Design a protein around this ligand. Structure first.
Ligand code: HEM
Ligand code: RTZ
Ligand code: NA
Length: 461
């Protein structure tokens, strides 16, 4: 029932959409066909969901029937199997629930973690300071800091900012991540041209393949040293202990094939999502020093200029919390979220969506819904503050989406964000370089929006 552009025969309408700037075209279609609209990519049926109401209805109200994930043809090059699907793209079932339940459970046992982020935050602060006067791109440093946190939890160790193996991981990660979006990936899935045609099959997802084999290196290295008599200190070990405990049946999702994919899912996700947000954070603090100052004093009032920040401070810091949430909302890191699929027929905003329809939850249309925020497209921290200035998180705040598939990294993310953000502003003040012009608000698109290239200088307080 949703209204869609007519699909030209053969390729469908995958021409009509620009996959190197997707969020734009989905907005340009939302203005003719309205809030809910549907497009055909070749055989595949799709129904883009825009605005809070339409999203919440599918993911929460009809959540039990939209938790599944649509199949990806091009995954074959990675070598995915029903046996090993990881978490991120695994189909709604026991294999997914096992790894999902294992993931969040294992992170919790691994206060202790709280201290570890601040430790890493130091090494970051230092790296920052070591360029006191000169302008520099903080994107790369943040990437390293955040990556060491998720590395600890999963690989048991942290890496030096100079380590070649480490920097190669980071690079492949960001490049692999771009691969997720584009023209070639979408059209490959649709038609069997990918198969038995090495020329394209090789080029697409290439970096991710290079990324995984650099992970397998780290894993086999890590596996070789795993001593069973020692309780797990990292997820890899914890997983290995499960592979031992569950050697009984080959049906279990705990296997060598899954280990690399699961660890990849968590390791990669922690690496870029938080780090990009922190890049947006610093940016919005140099283009809005007025907001930067207010936070900076609040820090001094509660935390102080001398002791490292602790999660227990967030409670007593309404502005810093509202800014961060605003940074995420405005940042709009993951515009179209992650593709969903209907397990059965459902109804959204009147229209009726048939089973097997790929769903695209446009979180941007929610994070910036006109009927919710007072100043949607402007950086307005007061979107999370009431009359007496107490923090309040609105429903429409869904940077982590919602439903059974909602981000299982939110707790970690929340922890990482607040601790890194405050630790930075506490010991530093960030301004645009004197000579340099105003850096753009707008963000480049590579599946996830990132702050357009910019520089800043960091000076102690
Ligand atoms: C600012 C930080 C982050 C943002 C904005 C974010 C956002 C998202 C979004 C939009 C989804 C899709 C939800 C859906 O399918 O409806 C998702 C899923 C997921 N995220 Fe994140 N995430 C962040 C951090 C993390 C971290 C730190 C981890 C792991 C350490 C992580 C791991 C995952 C996993 C495994 C899934 C898939 C879960 C499933 O499919 O059941 N994320 N996240
Ligand atoms: C919120 S959607 C999101 C957010 C951050 C990342 C990614 C997706 N992925 C996908 C995970 C991928 C990892 C390999 C095994 C199969 N799985 C699905 C990614 C892909 C490639 C490089 C970096 C990353 S980090
Ligand atoms: Na993929």
């Amino acid at each position: 029932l949703p209204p869609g552009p007519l699909p030209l025969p053969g390729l469908g309408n995958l021409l009509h959409v620009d996959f190197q700037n997707t969020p734009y075209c989905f907005d340009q279609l939302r203005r003719r066909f309205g809030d809910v609209f549907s497009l055909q990519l070749a055989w595949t049926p799709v129904v883009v969901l825009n605005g809070l109401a339409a999203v919440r209805e599918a993911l929460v109200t009809h959540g039990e029937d939209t938790a599944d994930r649509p199949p990806v043809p091009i995954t074959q090059i990675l070598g995915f199997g029903p046996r090993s699907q990881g978490v991120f793209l695994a189909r709604y079932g026991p294999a997914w629930r096992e790894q999902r339940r294992f993931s969040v459970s294992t992170l919790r046992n691994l206060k202790s973690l709280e201290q570890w982020v601040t430790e890493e935050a130091a090494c970051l602060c230092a790296a920052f300071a070591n360029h006191s006067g000169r302008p520099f791109r903080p994107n790369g440093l943040l990437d390293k800091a955040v990556s060491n946190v998720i590395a600890s939890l999963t690989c048991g160790r942290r890496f030096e900012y100079d380590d070649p193996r480490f920097l190669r991981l980071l690079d492949l990660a960001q490049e692999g991540l771009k691969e997720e979006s584009g023209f070639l990936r979408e059209v490959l899935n649709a038609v069997p041209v990918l198969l038995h045609i090495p020329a394209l099959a090789g080029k697409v997802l290439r970096f991710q393949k290079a990324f995984l084999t650099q992970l397998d290196e780290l894993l086999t290295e890590h596996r070789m040293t795993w001593d069973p008599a020692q309780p797990p200190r990292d997820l890899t070990e914890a997983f290995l202990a499960e592979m031992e405990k569950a050697k009984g049946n080959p049906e279990s999702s705990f296997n060598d094939e899954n280990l690399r994919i699961v660890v990849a899912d968590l390791f990669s996700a922690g690496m870029v999502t938080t780090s990009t947000t922190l890049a947006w954070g610093l940016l919005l603090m140099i283009l809005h020093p007025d907001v930067q100052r207010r936070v900076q004093q609040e820090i001094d009032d509660v935390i102080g200029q001398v002791r490292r920040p602790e999660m227990g401070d967030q409670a007593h810091m309404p502005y810093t919390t509202a800014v961060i949430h605003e940074v995420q909302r405005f940042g709009d890191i993951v515009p179209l979220g992650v593709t969903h699929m209907t397990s059965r027929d459902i109804e959204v905003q009147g229209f009726r969506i048939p089973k097997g329809t790929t769903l695209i939850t446009n979180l941007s249309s929610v994070l910036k819904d006109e009927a919710v925020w007072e100043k949607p497209f402007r950086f307005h921290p007061e979107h999370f503050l009431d009359a007496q200035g107490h923090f309040v998180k609105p429903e429409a705040f869904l940077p982590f989406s919602a439903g059974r598939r909602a981000c299982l990294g939110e707790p970690l993310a929340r922890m990482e964000l607040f601790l890194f953000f405050t630790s930075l502003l506490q010991h530093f003040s960030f301004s645009v370089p004197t000579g340099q012009p105003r850096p753009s608000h707008h963000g480049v698109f590579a599946f996830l929006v990132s702050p357009s290239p910019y520089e800043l200088c960091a000076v102690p307080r």
